[PDB]
Every structure is written in structure tokens, then in C-alpha cells.
Amino acid sequence: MKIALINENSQASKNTIIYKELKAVSDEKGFEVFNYGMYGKEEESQLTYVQNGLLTAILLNSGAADFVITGCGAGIGAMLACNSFPGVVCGFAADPVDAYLFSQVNGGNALSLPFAKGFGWGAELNLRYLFERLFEDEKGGGYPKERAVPEQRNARILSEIKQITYRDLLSVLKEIDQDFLKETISGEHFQEYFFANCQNQNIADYLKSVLD
Amino acid sequence: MKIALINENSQASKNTIIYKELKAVSDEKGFEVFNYGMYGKEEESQLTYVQNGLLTAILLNSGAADFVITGCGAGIGAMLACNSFPGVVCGFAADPVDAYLFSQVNGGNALSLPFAKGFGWGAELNLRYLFERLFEDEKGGGYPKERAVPEQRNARILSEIKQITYRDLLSVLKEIDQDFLKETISGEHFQEYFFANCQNQNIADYLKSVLD
Amino acid sequence: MKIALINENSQASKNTIIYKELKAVSDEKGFEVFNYGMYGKEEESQLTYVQNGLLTAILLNSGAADFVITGCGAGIGAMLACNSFPGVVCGFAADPVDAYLFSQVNGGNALSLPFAKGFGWGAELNLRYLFERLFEDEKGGGYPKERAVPEQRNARILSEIKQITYRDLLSVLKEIDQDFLKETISGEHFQEYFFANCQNQNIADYLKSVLD
Amino acid sequence: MKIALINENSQASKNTIIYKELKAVSDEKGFEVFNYGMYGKEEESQLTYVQNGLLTAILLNSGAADFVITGCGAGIGAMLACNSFPGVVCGFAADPVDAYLFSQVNGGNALSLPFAKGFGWGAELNLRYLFERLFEDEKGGGYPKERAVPEQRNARILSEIKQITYRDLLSVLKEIDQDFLKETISGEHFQEYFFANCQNQNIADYLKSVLD
């Protein structure tokens, strides 16, 4: 499993703190983790929470990441943005119970967190705890176990509905503001991490044209 | 302002509790509130959290409601479902601060709540408090006030992106499973509340054909 | 009603933020508020969370304050310290529901809050909300209303037990480390606020001897 | 280490749920756990939250338990009661971070939890998580590690102050309402668990006279 971290500009100063805990849990589980920034350093490429959503969609739909951690001050903006694209099921979690329930009941491929609201002394403990419970069990097993059938069914039906409601990502990538798109993929490590791990060549090819 | 309440089957037994607090705040503010159920009574029409999303989309896009309150056990399923349709900006809130921030920073048209996780003694106090802070200030004013400009801008840019990513609701309504759709709008008060308040005649007309 | 605010050294930088919200709610209700510090300024007299407890006990037992707000990083240290003295019933609250329940179920005379754990973006909103619900209703009314009888009874029985378990405050003041005591009452505004409002002349007299 | 669980009458129906998680964590760690009730069965001996405090004090001061878990609807009543006796340092915790911080910063011998407020779907997950973090590290190590010195010092100073403020437990046991005391120790398993593990023969002897 490949896990990506994406921070927007308001919470970029916490990227190191967040990555430290995510990396620790990932290392323990044998996952691969990629820090796509923002990193909290001067004159780096910038992301808004809306661009976090777009980048999340690019990473997940391409196969470059299997799961994305992102967020903002309250976590709600990034959640709203991530869920505005096809192929993204982005939850919200504030505590470790939220994270476990998300993995077992919803079984999505992204999670948005508050990195400022409620984020103070011991917040990195909460992050570690949350990440641990998020990956404690393989996703989609159901909670409680006896309710797995209807929970899995509804997640399946949601997926079927999303196939009808969203336009395909390639068309979206071509029609959105191209400066907005270019900025979203201008991170210092984007090309390195993305193109090495991308499994959708059509998306890779179009993004190459945007960058070259 | 017209506010709609939508509950799915797992939390239907709490509909009266939830509506009581929502109604109280609404009455105080001079809003109109519509309880679309589920109501928690035997042999009533059923909704899953995925159908909550569809119904939310129908009410908001048609103009039948200006704001929707919904949720499920954890609130995440309904949030995911609501945000899978065009014209819906559905947040999550667990506490009153979450609700205030949602109205001021994101300024969406729906909110999904946990009605089971963390929902115990004094949960109706939390609901009242949450609803009060949700409508304490007119939406989109920004928090803090000095950050209103970039917050309003990003919400605007999200809206622009959603115009490209979602297919139009009418096409969705025609292409989704029609039994799934019919059930979603088979509530005892749906026709009464919806058709009296619907401002989009094309949606009304198609839903009439589904029901007749 | 006279309300006192007491901060220890780790959270002294937040005193202004905390007092602003407490003052606002107090002004609205017609209460009197006294900021006993710490204030977060260089070379001011220092307090630990244990001294917060002692100062709380001095203010409440003397009648100089009717209610005390205090806390520390997590709020637990100050709570433990406050409850180690006679005549003090110090609760804990993290959210507005906690505060309402404390006033109605326990009806104590002090509350300890976390000023660092969970204290981030929008924390001053939480403070205002918490203070508003804390003083929304007169204390000891019971929650729910129908359970007022046993709740009031148990609070009464607790008070009876405390009369047996604690030694009287005057003896405590004489036997504790006198440098520890002197420091606790060496705040720039202690004499001004305390002696003007003290109703127990025996405590006033002994503290005068400690200071003179 | 010997861990005791004490529930009062309002939350007695949750004793099995609570004990299940406490037992699991205890078994994993090689601790001994004793369920002192209430158990949630008809015509059992009753405890109020004030009697929870007294029983906690008896178990800890006697050495019958090294740590006590208790609580009530909100957890605040039991906390207030426990901290009204000598030899008891009873914290409050709502989440796993609270529990870790309590063990490392305060290092007390009891914890009071909310078993109703915020206690709903997945509450037993929260309990397990909380208990796991509570005993993850040996108590009193300090958080962060670099602040261990002043944290340990203040806990030590609190202990010194408590030696002056509380009257000795034996005198308390003799002077409190004796029917109140008798009821507190009339649990079906009290004699079995207490007398087998009591290390203070003076307390054992007096309680024998109360019961015989």
C-alpha cells in the first residue's frame, strides 16, 4: 500500500509533525509513504485546500497512491474538495474511533483531518493514535462485524451512483483552469513521486503535456 | 429559509429528538422546517444513508429546501453520499464550534451529523447548541473576519470546479436505478412538502412521472 | 456573583484570550470578574497548577470570589489541586455540554479547563460557548429536571462528607510551606482584589501577617 | 498491579461492557482486575457516585487495589467524590490522549470516566483505546519527556499538600454515617476481593466490625 500526505498552505508548518507520525505507523505496517507537501519552507509551491482535492484525485485515480491523508484548519474544506472528483471517497476523522469506523464502515481511500481546530498540546499523540486505528484492520470488514453485509452493500451502491454522477477525470483535467492544474502539480517532489508510481498512462501523458 | 431534516433507518428512532431541537432553533430564527423522516414508526418507507444523499440533492437542487440536516450513526456515510451529487456542499459537525466554522468558512447548504457515535446523555443539548451556532451568523462571513477574502474565494473556486466535475442532476435522475429513486421519494410527506416548495419545474415534472 | 480567573505559568500566554471571553459573558450577565493572573508578562509573580488550587481555595473560602475559572495544559492538574482543599468543588469541562451539566448536576464553585490540549483554531469560540452554557441557568437545578432530587441530594451528601475529610483551611494555611503560600498570594493585583472582597476576617488577618 | 472497577447505579447496566474492555487490556498486560460492581442485576446492593469515592478511597488506601477505574453519567461526580478522601489522586478522561497524559503528567491512582455523556456507538472501542493508552507507559514518566522534572516535582508537592489538608482515613471511616459506610461495602464480592488483598490491617479490622 502506498500512502500520500498532502497539506495546504495554512497548515504547512505542521507537515513535519504530521509526516513523522504517519511515517512511524507506515514503517511499522510495511507501507510506503510519500510526502507531497506542502512542507512549510520558504518560497515553496503553494496549495489551497481546493487544490488538495484535485491532487488527491490525481494520485488516487492514477494509482500513484492507494490512500491519501490530507486536511486543513478544520478538515472540512479539503473533504469537500476531495469528494468533488470521481474515484475519491474522502472521510473526516477527529479522533481514533472516527478513523477505525471510517476504515471498517465506509472503507474509502482518503481521510481529511483537522490540523488546527482542536489541534494543540498532544495533537501528535492523537495523530499517531488515529493513524494506528485507521490501519489496525483491513478496510471494509464492517463494524460491528454482524453489520458487515448492509455496510458493504451501501458502500457498493454509493460507488455505483458515483459512476453516474461524476464526469471522467481526464475530461475534468482538460477542462479545468490549466494554471490552477499546473500549480497543483508543481511540487518539488511531484514528478519524482507521481510518474514513478502512476499506473494510468493516459493521465500521466496529459499531465506531462501540462508540465513540459 | 427552508430547512429540511432527513434521517436514514439506523437513526430513525432519534428523529423526534433531533427535530425537536431543530424546530426550536428554527422557530426562534423565523425559519421554516420540514421533517422528511424517517420518523421511527412501524412500516414506514425506508431510507439508507445513500438515499439520504439523493434526497438531499433533490431538495437542494429543486429549491424545495435551502439547507439540509442529515446524518447517520457516524455521519460520514451520509456526508459521502450528499457530496456525490451536483449542487450540494455537505459538511460534517460533531460540536458547536464545528457548526459555526462550517457556516462561516465553507458556507455550504447541508450538514451531516453523528446521531449514534458520541451520542448519549445530553446529546440533545449538543444538538440545540450546534444548531444555534450553525445559524448564529449569516453564512460565508469568514472566520476569523480578517480571513474572509481567501475563504470566500476558495469556496467560489470549489463551486466553479464542481460545475465541471458533476453531470447535471436531471440526467442523473434519469440514469440511476429507478426503484432506488422511487423509494427515496416515497416518504409519507414527500409529495406534500416537495411539490409545494419545488422551484425547478423540470425536476418536479420528472419526479411526477416516477411517482404517477 | 464574583468570578475569578487564575492561570498558571504554562498557559499564562493565553490569559488575555481567556479573560476576553469570560469578561464578555460576565458583562452580559451582570457578574463581576477579577483577573488574578498569571497575565503572561515578563518578570511577573509565578504560579504552578498546585498554587492555582491553593489560590482557588483562598478566594472561595474567604468569599472573595463566588466562582473560580482555572486550568492548565490539560486541566487535570489544577482540578486535582483545587479539590485537595476544603470548601472547593472543582469540576472539569472540555465542551459546552460539560459546562452546563456541571452547573446543573454538580453545582460546584470552580471549573478547570484544558488551555492547551485540544486548544487550537477556534478555541476562544469554545471558551465563549462554554462560559455561556456554564451560566445559562442558575446552578443546581438538575439535569434532566426530573432527576433534580437525587442529584441535589448527592451533592448535599458530598458536602457533608467533605466536612469530615478535610482539616479547616486556617490550620492548613498555617501549616503549609510559608514561602509556597507567600508566592501564591504575591500577584500584582492580589491584595487589591482579595482584601476589598474578603468576607472571612480570620483568613484576611492571617494572610496580612504572611505579607506584611 | 491490581485494578478495581467501580460503577454506581445510573451506569450499572454498562458494567459488563466496561469490564470486558478493561479485562482485555489487563490480561494483555498481566495485571489483575477486580470487578467490584455495580453489575447491573436485579436487587443488587446499590452505590451512588459519592459511595464510589468512598469505596475508591478504601481500596487504594488499604492496598486492595493499586488503581481504580470508576465514573458516572458525566464522570465529574465520581471524580469530585474520589478526590474528597486522603490517598486518592483521581483524574478525568474522555479520550485516549487524556488517559496517556494523566498517567505521564499526573501519575495518579484513579481515573473517572463518562459512561453516558458522549457514550454511544463505538463507545467500547473508545474504552479499549483509552485503557490501552492509560497503561501504555509506566506512570509518571512525564510528557513531553523533557518536562518530566517539573511535572514530577509538582505531583510530589501536591502529595505533600494533601498530607496537611486531609484528615486520616481511619478517623473518617469512624465519623462518617455508618449506614452509608456499611452500604458502600455490602457488594456481593466486596469481602472476597477486599480482605484477601488488603494490606492495611487497621482498616480491615474496623471494616470487619462494621460488617460483623
Q: 501519575: which residue's cell?
A: D107
Complete DSSP assignment for C77-124: HHHHHHTTSTT--EEE-SSHHHHHHIIIII--SEEEEESSTT--TTHH
Q: How far is CA D72 from each of CA C107, D23, D112, rounded to the nearest angstrom?
A: 16, 19, 8
In contact, B10 and B72? CB cutoff 8 Å = yes
Residue B138 Ramachandran class (φ > 0 left, ψ -120 to 50 alpha, else beta):
beta
Residue A100 CB burial class (10 angstroms; 0-12, 13-18, ≥19): buried
Rounded distance, CA C7 to CA D36, Å?
Answer: 38
Complete DSSP assignment for C128-184: HHHHHHHTTS-TT--SSGGGHHHHHHHHHHHHHHHHHHBPPHHHHHHHS-HHHHHHH
Residue C75 CB burial class (10 angstroms; 0-12, 13-18, ≥19): buried
Interface of B with C in 81-140 (CB under 8 A): 95-97, 100-101, 122, 125-126, 129, 133
Cell numbers that stand for C25 in this block = 459573558
The single-letter DSSP state of residue A14 is: G
Residue type, C146: E
- Chain C hits for A123, CB-CB cut-off 8 Å, are 120
CB contact under 8 A, D97 and A129: yes
In contact, B69 and B5? CB cutoff 8 Å = yes
Q: Which residues 6+ apart lie within 8 Å of C69 measured at CB?
A: C3, C4, C5, C6, C18, C22, C110, C111, C113, C131
Angle at B31 between CA B30 and CA B36, to 5 degrees: 145
Rounded distance, CA C119 to CA C140, Å?
Answer: 28
Residue A172 CB burial class (10 angstroms; 0-12, 13-18, ≥19): buried
Count CB-CB contacts under 10 A for residue C23.
16
Q: Are strands D32-35 and B32-35 parallel, antiparallel or unpaired?
A: unpaired
Complete DSSP assignment for A189-201: THHHHHHHH---H
Q: How far is CA D203 from each of CA A41, D169, D184, rounded to the nearest angstrom?
A: 63, 8, 14
Rounded distance, CA C25 to CA C129, Å?
Answer: 9
Closest Cα of chain C to B96: distance in Å? Answer: 8
Rounded distance, CA D58 to CA D45, Å?
Answer: 17
Which one, of D55, D57, D49, D50, lies nearest residue D86 by Cα?
D57
How big is chain C, counted in residues? 212
Strand partners, C68: C4, C110
Q: How far is CA D149 from each of CA C77, D152, D156, rounded to the nearest angstrom?
A: 15, 5, 11
Strand partners, B90: B110
Selecting from D76, D83, D167 the residue whose C-beta is nearest the C-beta of C106 gives: D76
In contact, B93 and B135? CB cutoff 8 Å = no
Q: 462561516: which residue's cell?
A: B104
Which one, of A32, A12, A39, A17, lies nearest residue A135 by Cα?
A32
Residue A60 Ramachandran class (φ > 0 left, ψ -120 to 50 alpha, else beta):
alpha
Q: Angle formed by the axes of helices C49-62 and C201-211, to 10°?
A: 140
Rounded distance, CA B172 to CA B159, Å?
Answer: 19
Residue C197 CB burial class (10 angstroms; 0-12, 13-18, ≥19): middle
Which one, of A163, C136, B183, C10, lies nearest residue D144 by Cα?
C10
CB contact under 8 A, A91 and B83: no
Q: 510530589: which residue's cell?
A: D156
In contact, D75 and D113? CB cutoff 8 Å = yes
Which one, of B104, B67, B105, B103, lies nearest residue B87 by Cα?
B67
Q: How far is CA A146 from each of CA A104, A143, B46, B75, C141, rounded to the nearest angstrom?
A: 12, 7, 20, 20, 42
Q: Are strands A110-114 and B32-35 parallel, antiparallel or unpaired?
A: unpaired
Which one, of C79, C62, C45, lies nearest residue C2 by Cα?
C62
Cell numbers that stand for B60 in this block = 437542494
Residue type, C7: N
How big is chain D, counted in residues? 212
Selecting from D100, D122, D125 the residue whose C-beta is nearest the C-beta of A125 gives: D100
HEC secondary structure over chain B:
CEEEECCCHHHHHHHHHHHHHHHHHHHHHCCEEEECCCCCCCCCCCCCHHHHHHHHHHHHHHCCCCEEEEEECCCHHHHHHHCCCCCCCEEECCCHHHHHHHHHHHCCCEEEEECCCCCCCCHHHHHHHHHHHHCCCCCCCCCCHHHHHHHHHHHHHHHHHHHHHECCHHHHHHHCCHHHHHHHCCCCCHHHHHHHHCCCHHHHHHHHHHHC
Q: How far is CA A97 from each of CA A19, A135, A199, D25, rounded to the nearest angstrom?
A: 20, 12, 33, 17
Complete DSSP assignment for C41-54: -TTPPP--HHHHHH
In contact, A90 and A82? CB cutoff 8 Å = yes
Count CB-CB contacts under 10 A for residue D206.
16
Neighbours of chain C (3+ CB pairs under 8 A): A, B, D
Rounded distance, CA C25 to CA C5, Å?
Answer: 13
Rounded distance, CA C95 to CA A16, Å?
Answer: 29
Which one, of C119, D133, D122, lies nearest residue B118 by Cα?
D122
In contact, B211 and B178? CB cutoff 8 Å = no
In contact, D28 and D58? CB cutoff 8 Å = no
- Give the residue from C80, C106, C152, C176 with the most D CB atoms within 10 Å of its CB, the best one to mutate: C80
C143 touches chain B (CB under 8 A): yes
Count CB-CB contacts under 10 A for residue A171.
12
Which one, of B61, B91, D207, lies nearest residue A91 by Cα?
B91
Q: How far is CA A45 from each of CA A15, A69, A189, C85, rounded to the nearest angstrom?
A: 14, 19, 11, 56
Which one, of B126, C71, B38, lies nearest residue D116 by Cα?
B126
- Chain C hits for B133, CB-CB cut-off 8 Å, are 129
The residue in chain B having the minimum alpha-carbon distance to the alpha carbon of residue D72 is B121
Residue B142 Ramachandran class (φ > 0 left, ψ -120 to 50 alpha, else beta):
left
- Structural element, H or E, at residue C17: helix C15-29
φ/ψ (deg, to 5) at A4: -110, 140
Helices of type H across chain A? 15-29, 49-62, 76-82, 96-101, 123-134, 148-165, 169-175, 178-184, 190-197, 201-211
CB contact under 8 A, B157 and A50: yes
CB contact under 8 A, D97 and A133: no
Resolution in A: 2.0
Neighbours of chain A (3+ CB pairs under 8 A): B, C, D
Neighbours of chain B (3+ CB pairs under 8 A): A, C, D
A77 touches chain B (CB under 8 A): yes
Cell numbers that stand for C11 in this block = 498557559
CB contact under 8 A, D120 and B122: no
Cell numbers that stand for C101 in this block = 451539566
Which one, of D93, D124, D120, D119, lies nearest residue D108 by Cα?
D93
Q: Which residues 6+ apart lie within 8 Å of D138 measured at CB?
A: none
In contact, B24 and B55? CB cutoff 8 Å = no
C-alpha dihedral (D154, D155, D156, D159), degrees to nearest 10: 120
CA D26 to chain centre: 15
φ/ψ (deg, to 5) at A9: -65, -35
Rounded distance, CA A57 to CA B92, Å?
Answer: 20
Q: 486556617: which residue's cell?
A: C170
- Chain D hits for A125, CB-CB cut-off 8 Å, are 97, 100-101
Strand partners, D166: C166
Residue type, C209: S
* Domains (range + CATH), chain C: 1-212 (3.40.1400.10)
Residue type, A41: K
In contact, B130 and B137? CB cutoff 8 Å = no
Which one, of C206, B147, C119, B1, lies nearest residue A48 by Cα?
B147
In contact, D105 and D139? CB cutoff 8 Å = no
Angle at C149 between CA C143 and CA C150, to 5 degrees: 85
Rounded distance, CA B172 to CA B53, Å?
Answer: 13
- Chain D hits for C157, CB-CB cut-off 8 Å, are 48, 50, 180
Q: Taking the alpha carbons of C27, C29, C33, C39 in that order, is the dihedral positive or negative?
A: negative
CB contact under 8 A, A176 and B166: no
Q: How far is CA A182 from each of CA A41, A55, A202, D84, rounded to the nearest angstrom?
A: 20, 11, 17, 64
The single-letter DSSP state of residue C74 is: S
Cell numbers that stand for C79 in this block = 482540578
Selecting from A80, A157, A175 the residue whose C-beta is nearest the C-beta of B50 gives: A157
Q: Angle formed by the axes of helices C49-62 and D148-165, to 10°?
A: 30
In contact, C109 and C68? CB cutoff 8 Å = yes
Count CB-CB contacts under 10 A for residue C123.
23
Long-range contacts of B47-50 (CB under 8 A, 24+ apart): B47/B6, B47/B7, B47/B8, B47/B9, B47/B183, B47/B184, B47/B187, B48/A150, B48/A154, B48/A157, B48/B8, B48/B9, B49/A154, B49/B8, B49/B10, B49/B77, B49/B78, B49/B81, B50/A154, B50/A157, B50/A158, B50/A161, B50/B77, B50/B81
Cell numbers that stand for A135 in this block = 490501519
Q: How far is CA B58 from each of CA B35, B82, B114, D86, rounded to the nearest angstrom?
A: 15, 10, 22, 63
Q: How far is CA C58 from each of CA C18, C205, C206, C211, D92, rounded to the nearest angstrom?
A: 21, 13, 11, 14, 24
In contact, B47 and B6? CB cutoff 8 Å = yes
Residue B179 CB burial class (10 angstroms; 0-12, 13-18, ≥19): exposed
Cell numbers that stand for A167 in this block = 464526469
In contact, A58 and A52? CB cutoff 8 Å = no
C-alpha dihedral (C147, C153, C157, C162), degrees to nearest 10: 70
HEC secondary structure over chain D:
CEEEECCCHHHHHHHHHHHHHHHHHHHHHCCEEEECCCCCCCCCCCCCHHHHHHHHHHHHHHCCCCEEEEEECCCHHHHHHHCCCCCCCEEECCCHHHHHHHHHHHCCCEEEEECCCCCCCCHHHHHHHHHHHHCCCCCCCCCCHHHHHHHHHHHHHHHHHHHHHECCHHHHHHHCCHHHHHHHCCCCCHHHHHHHHCCCHHHHHHHHHHHC
Experimental technique for the deposited model: X-ray
Q: What distance, in Å, lies between the first and last C-alpha atoms of chain B?
A: 29
Helix (H, G, I), strand (E, B) or coil at A93: coil
Which one, of A24, A32, A5, A49, lies nearest residue A184 by Cα?
A49
In contact, C191 and C204? CB cutoff 8 Å = no
Q: Which residues 6+ apart lie within 8 Å of A146 measured at CB?
A: none
Rounded distance, CA D67 to CA D87, Å?
Answer: 12
Closest Cα of chain D to B17: distance in Å? Answer: 15
CB contact under 8 A, B125 and C100: yes
Helix (H, G, I), strand (E, B) or coil at C3: strand
The residue in chain C having the minimum alpha-carbon distance to the alpha carbon of residue B95 is C95
Q: Which residues 6+ apart lie within 8 Å of A207 measured at CB?
A: A58, A173, A185, A194
Which one, of A153, A140, A109, lies nearest residue B51 by Cα?
A153
Rounded distance, CA D51 to CA D33, Å?
Answer: 20
In contact, D88 and D95? CB cutoff 8 Å = no
CB contact under 8 A, C122 and B96: no
- Chain C hits for D175, CB-CB cut-off 8 Å, are 164
Q: How far is CA B121 from each of CA B20, D10, D72, D93, D119, rounded to the nearest angstrom?
A: 16, 11, 11, 16, 7
Rounded distance, CA D197 to CA D194, Å?
Answer: 5
Q: What distance, in Å, lies between the first and last C-alpha atoms of chain D?
A: 29
Q: What distance, in Å, lies between the first and last C-alpha atoms of chain C?
A: 29
Rounded distance, CA B52 to CA B183, Å?
Answer: 11
Cβ–Cβ pairs < 8 A, chains B and C: 29
CA C7 to chain centre: 10
Which one, of D137, A94, A55, lies nearest residue B98 by Cα?
A94
Helix (H, G, I), strand (E, B) or coil at A32: strand
Walk across the sheet containing D32-35 and list its strands: D32-35, D2-5, D67-72, D110-114, D90-92
- Structural element, H or E, at residue A72: strand A67-72
Q: How far is CA D36 from each of CA D108, D188, D190, rounded to the nearest angstrom?
A: 20, 8, 7
Helix (H, G, I), strand (E, B) or coil at C55: helix
Cell numbers that stand for B68 in this block = 439540509
Q: Which residues 6+ apart lie within 8 Å of D209 measured at CB?
A: none
CA B105 to chain centre: 18
Rounded distance, CA B10 to CA B64, Å?
Answer: 25
The residue in chain C having the minimum alpha-carbon distance to the alpha carbon of residue A121 is C117
Interface of A with C in 21-60 (CB under 8 A): none
